[PDB]
Structure formats: structure tokens, C-alpha cells
Amino acid sequence: GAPPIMGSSVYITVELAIAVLAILGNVLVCWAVWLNSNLQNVTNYFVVSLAAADILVGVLAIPFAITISTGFCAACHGCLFIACFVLVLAQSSIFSLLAIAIDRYIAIAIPLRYNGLVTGTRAAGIIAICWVLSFAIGLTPMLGWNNCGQPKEGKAHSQGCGEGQVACLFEDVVPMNYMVYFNFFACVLVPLLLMLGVYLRIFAAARRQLADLEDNWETLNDNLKVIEKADNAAQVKDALTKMRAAALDAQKKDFRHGFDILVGQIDDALKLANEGKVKEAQAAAEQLKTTRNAYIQKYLERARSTLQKEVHAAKSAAIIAGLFALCWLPLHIINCFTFFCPDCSHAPLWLMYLAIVLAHTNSVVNPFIYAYRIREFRQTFRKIIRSHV
Ligand SMILES: CC(C)CCC[C@@H](C)[C@H]1CC[C@H]2[C@@H]3CC=C4C[C@@H](O)CC[C@]4(C)[C@H]3CC[C@]12C
Ligand SMILES: CC(C)CCC[C@@H](C)[C@H]1CC[C@H]2[C@@H]3CC=C4C[C@@H](O)CC[C@]4(C)[C@H]3CC[C@]12C
Ligand SMILES: CC(C)CCC[C@@H](C)[C@H]1CC[C@H]2[C@@H]3CC=C4C[C@@H](O)CC[C@]4(C)[C@H]3CC[C@]12C
Ligand SMILES: CC(C)CCC[C@@H](C)[C@H]1CC[C@H]2[C@@H]3CC=C4C[C@@H](O)CC[C@]4(C)[C@H]3CC[C@]12C
Ligand SMILES: CCCCCCCC/C=C\CCCCCCCC(=O)OC[C@H](O)CO
Ligand SMILES: CCCCCCCC/C=C\CCCCCCCC(=O)OC[C@H](O)CO
Ligand SMILES: CCCCCCCC/C=C\CCCCCCCC(=O)OC[C@H](O)CO
Ligand SMILES: Nc1nnc(-c2ccc(O)c(Cl)c2)c(-c2ccccc2)n1
Ligand SMILES: CCCCCCCC/C=C\CCCCCCCC(=O)O
Ligand SMILES: CCCCCCCC/C=C\CCCCCCCC(=O)O
Ligand SMILES: CCCCCCCC/C=C\CCCCCCCC(=O)O
Ligand SMILES: CCCCCCCC/C=C\CCCCCCCC(=O)O
Ligand code: NA
């Protein structure tokens, strides 16, 4: 049995390194949103709330994790508070991640009413409510669902603890049925699965909208060829009626002027077709190609460019949520083995430490995802770093 302070010194040193990195990176995130008005939107208010939770991981949760690794003597409910506080921060992160996914779904599904529905004031209130619910969920053991009623008196006596004190260890005060059923299954796993469902709807909605853009583009060009090789006025009328309805479907200053020309030129050719003037209607329909090359194709391309940027932003947000799950699942899976397999030896202490360090490292990774995937964050990070450090 090697001296406990040796392995403890490695764990503590790594934790402090993570704490420094989590504070520095996420303070940079908050400073970038504060300075850059192009970053001041509802989506990034939840990003800041998430960064604040990660700052508090370095300032409070990691010092608390270091403290509870010592098993020091403490009043049981005080031990319970410093053990449960990380649950508050994790829950707050889940609420922010779920809000970000929903915010991106609203923007892709109903962009015409996104600015009216999703405002900064309503976002600040949602953030406040989610922080309150995070304290209620994470400190639920403080309300009585704890093991303070059944202290490990032998462990407490062997460490010289006083009356009412226990050796402060996470699994001695926080009930494992809380950790598995309430915290993991209900409060972590279910919201993560909801997020997965939201992102599946975002990508399915983007793929369908991009398909609809190309369908209207193909229908516009196909019916143009139909008019050219038509032999009577009725065939020209049939193709023009399909173009007029599709031109209005794709319409939903230079943008409006382009479609005003397009619909008017269709009406011009339609009137000639209804008068039995096939050659004159076909020549009038040929003028649609000039409007298509100068206006309609530009709108198609900019509409496509906007959807591809929303896909890119949703993937970046999904990477953040997926990395949260990857970093926290080992801890929860270990708790499942402890809880569901009492015939299995408990996961060894070094693996517990590794799983804790991994969870804490998630508070370091988000600034790097923003810097590598979001140009506005990357450029703002450079301005802050070049001008102030
Ligand atoms: C404004 C912010 C920064 C203040 C942070 C306050 C923190 C550090 C305080 C608040 C409550 C405190 C705990 C309250 C009760 C106990 C029981 C005692 O037997 C050991 C210490 C312990 C476990 C305390 C540790 C420090 C503690 C967690
Ligand atoms: C944010 C919410 C939780 C309130 C903020 C105040 C917190 C940080 C402080 C204020 C008073 C503190 C409590 C005061 C008294 C006790 C009883 C003792 O046997 C163990 C510590 C314990 C349980 C403290 C835990 C932390 C505590 C609840
Ligand atoms: C992709 C990520 C999320 C997967 C994480 C898988 C990890 C957490 C799993 C894979 C194998 C698992 C181990 C397999 C066997 C045992 C032996 C048992 O006596 C204690 C638990 C323990 C030690 C498990 C702990 C958790 C474990 C290490
Ligand atoms: C990752 C998402 C999608 C699902 C999460 C999977 C979790 C809940 C699964 C994956 C592997 C599972 C464990 C695999 C093996 C055992 C050993 C058995 O003696 C008791 C149950 C137990 C401990 C399982 C509990 C639940 C478990 C941890
Ligand atoms: C910025 C700060 C700079 C540096 C701050 C460093 C703080 C380290 C403080 C105490 C660690 C004491 C370590 C003692 C750990 C005892 C060994 C142990 O792990 O025993 C646990 C056992 O599980 C129990 O029952
Ligand atoms: C500006 C940011 C805000 C400041 C953030 C606060 C930082 C808190 C640091 C460490 C918490 C450690 C608390 C636990 C220490 C307990 C050690 C102890 O109490 O030991 C005596 C006890 O009786 C055992 O026998
Ligand atoms: C485990 C513990 C769980 C605790 C369970 C109980 C929690 C209460 C739940 C939600 C409160 C919702 C907040 C309502 C605050 C007022 C919102 C409001 O006024 O909205 C009007 C706004 O103008 C519209 O646009
Ligand atoms: N058995 C066990 N032991 N320790 C922790 C623990 C304590 C402090 C922390 O800072 C961290 Cl990250 C983890 C968890 C645990 C597992 C999942 C979610 C929250 C806590 N589970
Ligand atoms: C580019 C600037 C980076 C900032 C530098 C700060 C890095 C320091 C990080 C970790 C060092 C940890 C100190 C550990 C002290 C001893 C703890 C112990 O053994 O118990
Ligand atoms: C920027 C402010 C950050 C706060 C500074 C906290 C840094 C100190 C690091 C870890 C706290 C150590 C807790 C001591 C455990 C007591 C051991 C014992 O009593 O047996
Ligand atoms: C003990 C906590 C359990 C009950 C949780 C109650 C939910 C949170 C309560 C109040 C949050 C206060 C902020 C409300 C302002 C809303 C602003 C808005 O949405 O536009
Ligand atoms: C992504 C692959 C991971 C690469 C580095 C991480 C190392 C993996 C660590 C632990 C995996 C399982 C270790 C087995 C625990 C011992 C079983 C026991 O004795 O109870
Ligand atoms: Na987090």
C-alpha cells in the first residue's frame, strides 16, 4: 500500500491544471460575447450560461472534488453540500445544451417568427429559471434523500471525527439510487436523448428544405423546356401555371424585384397562351431565362448558403452536446455498475479519479470548439489575445 499522498498529489495536480484551463478558456468566451455585438444573440446567451457553469467548475467544483477526495472529517450535511454542488453545475449545463438545441430548431423550422418568439429578455428569464431548477435538482439530497441518517461510524471513529461528523466521501453521503435513477436516468439521460431527437429534427428539416429549394429550381427549368418544345397553346398554359404557383412558393428589395419580374413575365406569357398565340407565348417565356440568370439563381444560391451555415452551426452545437455526453457517461456508467452489480468489485480508485478528471475536462473543451468551428468567436478571441495578453 503506497502512501496515499503520492497518488493523491497526481490527482490534485491534474485537477488544478484543469481548473486553470477551464477558467481561462471560458472567461475568454464570456469576454468575447461581451465585446462583440455580432456574438450577442439568444443562442450565445445560453453559451455564456454554459461557460459560467464551466467557470464555476474550476472555481468551486474542482476545489470541492479535491476536498472530498481526502475523506476529511466534516458535518455530514456540509459534506453533502460540497459533494452535490457539481450536480448543480452539470444540471445547469444540460439545461443550457437543451436550450441551444431548441433555439437552433426554432430558427431552422420557423425562421419567419424566430425573432418575435425567441428574444433576449425571455432568454434571460429562461436562464434564471434553469439555474434555480439546477440547484433544486442538484441539491435534492440536501432535502433528505441522503445517507446522513446512517453514517459510517467505524470509518468516522477510525479517522478521529467528532460527534455528528463523517469522513467526507461522495459515495458515503450521496445515495446511489439518487445518482442512478434520479440524477442519471431522469435528469441526465432523458434530456440528452431529447437533445438527440431535437438535432435529428434539425438535420432532417434542413435536408428537406434544401431538397425543396432544388425541386423548385428543377421545376422552373423543366417547365421552361416544356414550353419550348410545345406545339399548342394549351401545353404552354399548363407549364406556365405550374411555374407561376412554384414561383410564389419559392418567393416565400433586389429579391422582391426579381420575383416581381418573374411572376409578371409568367402572367404575360399566360395571357398570350390563353389567346391561342403559341409562338408569342413561347418567345415571352424565353424572357424568363434572363430573370432566372440575373435574380432567381442568386436567390437560390443565397438561400442554399444560409441553410448550409445553419447546418454547420447545428453540427458545432451538436459536437458540444456529444462531448458533454462522452465526458460524463463513464462516471454514470461506473455508478450503474456499483449500484446494479453488488457482486462486482467496486471500480478501483484510480479509475474513479480518471472518470472525474475526464468529466472536469469537458469544462475545458468548449472554448476550443468555438474557436475551431465558429469564425466570429475565433476572430474575437484573436483580438482579445493580441490586444490584452
Ligand atoms: C461566494 C462563494 C465564493 C462562497 C463559497 C462558500 C463555500 C466555500 C463554503 C459554503 C458552505 C461551506 C461548508 C459548510 C459546512 C461544512 C461542514 C464542516 O464540518 C466542514 C466544512 C464545510 C463542508 C464547509 C466548507 C466550505 C463551504 C462549502
Ligand atoms: C444556494 C443555497 C443552497 C443557499 C446558499 C447558502 C449556502 C451556501 C450555505 C448557507 C448556510 C449553510 C448551511 C448552514 C448549516 C449547516 C448545518 C451543518 O450541520 C452542516 C453545513 C450546513 C448544511 C451548511 C451548508 C451550506 C449552507 C446551506
Ligand atoms: C464511450 C464511453 C462513454 C464508454 C465508457 C465505458 C467505460 C466507462 C466502461 C467500459 C468497461 C467498464 C468496466 C468493465 C468491468 C468492470 C469491473 C467491475 O468489477 C467494476 C466496474 C468495471 C471496472 C467497469 C467500469 C466501467 C467501464 C470502464
Ligand atoms: C449511452 C446511452 C445511449 C445508454 C446508457 C447505457 C447504460 C445505461 C448501460 C450500458 C451498459 C450497462 C451495464 C452493462 C452491464 C451491467 C452488469 C450487470 O451485472 C448489471 C447492469 C450493468 C451495470 C449495466 C447497467 C446499464 C448500463 C451502464
Ligand atoms: C491554488 C492552490 C495551490 C495548491 C493547493 C493544494 C491543495 C491540497 C490540499 C490538501 C490535500 C491534502 C492531501 C491529503 C490526501 C490524503 C490521502 C488520501 O487520498 O486519503 C483519502 C481516503 O480515501 C480517505 O478515507
Ligand atoms: C473568488 C471565487 C470565490 C471563492 C471560492 C471559494 C474557494 C473555496 C476553496 C476551497 C473549498 C474547500 C472547502 C472545504 C475545506 C474543508 C477543510 C476543513 O474544514 O478541515 C477541518 C475539518 O474539521 C476537517 O476535520
Ligand atoms: C425537482 C424540483 C422541481 C420543481 C417544480 C416546480 C418548478 C416550477 C416550474 C416552472 C416555473 C415556470 C416559471 C414561471 C415564471 C413566470 C413566467 C412568465 O411570467 O411568462 C410570461 C411571459 O411574458 C411569456 O412571454
Ligand atoms: N461515485 C461517484 N463519485 N464521485 C463523483 C464525483 C464527485 C465530484 C465531482 O466533481 C465529480 Cl465530476 C464526480 C460521482 C459523480 C458521478 C456523476 C455525476 C456527478 C458526480 N460519482
Ligand atoms: C500560458 C499560461 C498558463 C498558466 C500557467 C499555470 C499552470 C499551472 C497548472 C498546474 C500546476 C499545479 C500546481 C500543483 C502544486 C502542488 C499540489 C500538490 O502536490 O498537492
Ligand atoms: C480564483 C479562486 C479559486 C479558489 C482557490 C482554491 C484553490 C485551493 C485548492 C483546493 C482546496 C483544498 C481543500 C483542502 C482539503 C483539506 C484536507 C484535510 O483537511 O484533510
Ligand atoms: C426550490 C426551487 C423549486 C421550484 C422552481 C421554480 C422555478 C424557478 C422560479 C423562478 C425563476 C425566476 C425568474 C422568472 C422570470 C421569467 C422571465 C421570462 O421568462 O421572460
Ligand atoms: C479511449 C480508450 C481509453 C484510452 C485510455 C484510458 C484507459 C482506460 C481505463 C480503464 C478501462 C477499464 C479498466 C479496468 C478496471 C479494472 C477492473 C477491476 O479490477 O475491477
Ligand atoms: Na459544463
Side-chain angles (χ1 to χ4, degrees):
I5 197 187
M6 299 187 60
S8 178
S9 300
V10 168
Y11 165 72
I12 290 172
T13 300
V14 172
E15 288 273 60
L16 294 177
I18 296 167
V20 172
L21 293 174
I23 291 166
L24 286 180
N26 286 286
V27 161
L28 185 68
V29 171
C30 296
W31 195 239
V33 177
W34 178 278
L35 291 183
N36 194 342
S37 64
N38 304 327
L39 288 173
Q40 294 174 358
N41 49 71
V42 171
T43 312
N44 286 345
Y45 301 151
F46 296 109
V47 170
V48 169
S49 181
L50 182 59
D54 287 328
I55 290 169
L56 295 175
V57 167
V59 172
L60 295 176
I62 285 176
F64 291 176
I66 292 167
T67 308
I68 64 186
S69 74
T70 68
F72 79 113
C73 294
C76 190
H77 292 88
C79 180
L80 193 56
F81 178 79
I82 64 178
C84 289
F85 187 74
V86 70
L87 301 174
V88 177
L89 300 182
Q91 202 60 42
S92 180
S93 302
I94 287 169
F95 285 146
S96 293
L97 290 172
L98 179 55
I100 292 167
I102 293 177
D103 178 79
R104 290 296 82 206
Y105 175 75
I106 298 174
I108 196 73
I110 43 176
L112 296 180
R113 41 188 170 181
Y114 171 86
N115 290 333
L117 161 63
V118 194
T119 60
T121 299
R122 299 175 183 170
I126 292 176
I127 290 174
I129 293 175
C130 290
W131 273 102
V132 173
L133 298 174
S134 295
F135 275 91
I137 288 175
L139 304 185
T140 281
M142 306 285 297
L143 309 183
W145 195 358
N146 59 63
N147 295 326
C148 289
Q150 308 86 33
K152 293 187 180 300
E153 226 62 271
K155 187 180 297 186
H157 289 304
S158 64
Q159 303 186 8
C161 300
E163 299 300 326
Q165 290 188 338
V166 298
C168 184
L169 297 170
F170 187 98
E171 295 188 21
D172 289 358
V173 297
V174 185
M176 197 59 77
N177 51 14
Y178 167 85
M179 284 303 297
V180 169
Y181 289 137
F182 190 97
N183 190 263
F184 183 31
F185 289 176
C187 293
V188 174
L189 200 54
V190 165
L192 287 175
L193 296 177
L194 289 179
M195 292 179 213
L196 176 60
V198 173
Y199 281 113
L200 288 177
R201 292 181 172 267
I202 292 177
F203 297 130
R207 174 195 49 181
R208 135 139 284 195
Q209 288 178 27
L210 284 161
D212 292 353
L213 280 177
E214 296 297 332
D215 280 355
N216 289 333
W217 177 252
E218 291 172 7
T219 301
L220 186 64
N221 290 325
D222 288 331
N223 284 322
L224 275 176
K225 299 176 181 299
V226 171
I227 297 172
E228 293 174 7
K229 59 182 56 182
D231 66 328
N232 57 82
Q235 296 176 356
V236 179
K237 176 184 180 179
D238 274 304
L240 285 165
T241 54
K242 295 182 180 180
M243 292 173 68
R244 195 186 191 276
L248 303 178
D249 183 77
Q251 191 173 9
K252 300 182 180 181
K253 300 176 182 178
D254 308 331
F255 152 82
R256 167 158 294 277
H257 187 57
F259 278 99
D260 287 336
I261 299 168
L262 191 68
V263 179
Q265 287 175 326
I266 294 171
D267 293 330
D268 292 354
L270 265 172
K271 177 181 176 298
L272 300 165
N274 289 322
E275 296 172 344
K277 307 178 181 182
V278 192
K279 289 290 184 173
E280 197 172 341
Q282 290 172 312
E286 203 68 27
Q287 311 296 322
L288 296 160
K289 288 180 174 174
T290 304
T291 311
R292 175 198 59 186
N293 303 336
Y295 297 95
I296 309 305
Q297 200 207 48
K298 294 188 183 71
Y299 167 74
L300 164 69
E301 281 161 1
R302 296 195 189 193
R304 188 192 310 154
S305 175
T306 299
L307 283 171
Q308 294 171 354
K309 292 178 182 180
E310 285 182 280
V311 176
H312 180 82
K315 287 180 178 176
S316 297
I319 289 169
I320 298 280
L323 289 175
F324 183 93
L326 183 68
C327 291
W328 283 95
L329 274 173
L331 270 173
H332 290 292
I333 292 168
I334 292 169
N335 285 342
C336 288
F337 273 94
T338 301
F339 183 66
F340 288 122
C341 189
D343 301 333
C344 298
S345 294
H346 197 292
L349 180 60
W350 66 264
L351 184 53
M352 303 306 304
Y353 285 164
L354 184 58
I356 289 172
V357 159
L358 172 62
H360 291 158
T361 305
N362 183 72
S363 290
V364 187
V365 300
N366 292 2
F368 284 88
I369 306 296
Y370 302 141
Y372 276 103
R373 297 198 51 92
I374 308 175
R375 179 179 293 100
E376 195 69 30
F377 269 110
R378 175 170 61 251
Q379 295 176 343
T380 311
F381 290 167
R382 292 188 175 271
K383 287 187 178 181
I384 297 171
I385 288 155
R386 290 176 189 175
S387 301
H388 297 102
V389 321

